[PDB]
C-alpha cells in the first residue's frame, strides 16, 4: 500500500536552464561585491530591503 518512489521528481515538468553570461571569478567578483554594497549606496530611511528582496 502506497510507497511510490520518485513520484514528484518524475512528475515535475522539465524546464531547461537558460543560457546566461558567465560570472566573474576571484578578485573581480569580490570587486563587484564591494562596489555593490559599499560604493554606489542608495540612502534609505529605514533600510528594510534585502539583496534578494522581490515584491
Amino acid at each position: 500500500s502506497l510507497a511510490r518512489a520518485g513520484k514528484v521528481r518524475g512528475q515535475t515538468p522539465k524546464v531547461a536552464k537558460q543560457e546566461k553570461k558567465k560570472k566573474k571569478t576571484g578578485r573581480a567578483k569580490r570587486r563587484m561585491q564591494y562596489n555593490r554594497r559599499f560604493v554606489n549606496v542608495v540612502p534609505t530611511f529605514g533600510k528594510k530591503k534585502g539583496p534578494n528582496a522581490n515584491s
Binding site: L2, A3, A5, G6, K7, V8, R9
Partner: protein
Amino acid sequence: GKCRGLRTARKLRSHRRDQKWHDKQYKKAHLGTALKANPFGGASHAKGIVLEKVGVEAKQPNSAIRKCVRVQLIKNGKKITAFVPNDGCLNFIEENDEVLVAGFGRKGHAVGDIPGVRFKVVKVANVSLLALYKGKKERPR
C-alpha cells in the same frame, strides 16, 4: 565540602576517576561495551550486501514512508537498516547489491522521523548515490 590539604592528591585523583565513570559519554567511550555493540566496529563506513527493501513508517506527528534497506555487513555479518535519502534513489538499488553505508549523523542515535535507523546508504555498486541522482554516472550490475 572538598578536601584541600597539601597531601590530598591521591584522594582527589581517585575521586576524580571514580566520578568520571559516572559520565555518560566517558562511559560510552571507555567501558568498551558500546564499541562491540556498534555494528561498524569503530569504522567511519562499512560495506554490506542488500538483503531487502523496507518501508519504515515515520513517527507520530509526521505521515510518510521512508525507503530503507536491510543490509548485512561483510566484515562481521551483522544486520543493519540504512536509509536511502533522495526521491527515487531506492530504484537504483536491487537485491543482493554491494552497498557502502555510513552513519547518519548523531553518532549511533536515531535521527528525525525514522524510528531505529542510524545509517544511510552512501554508495551503490561502487558508484555514489549523488552521481546517480544528479545523473553524472551510470551504474553497473
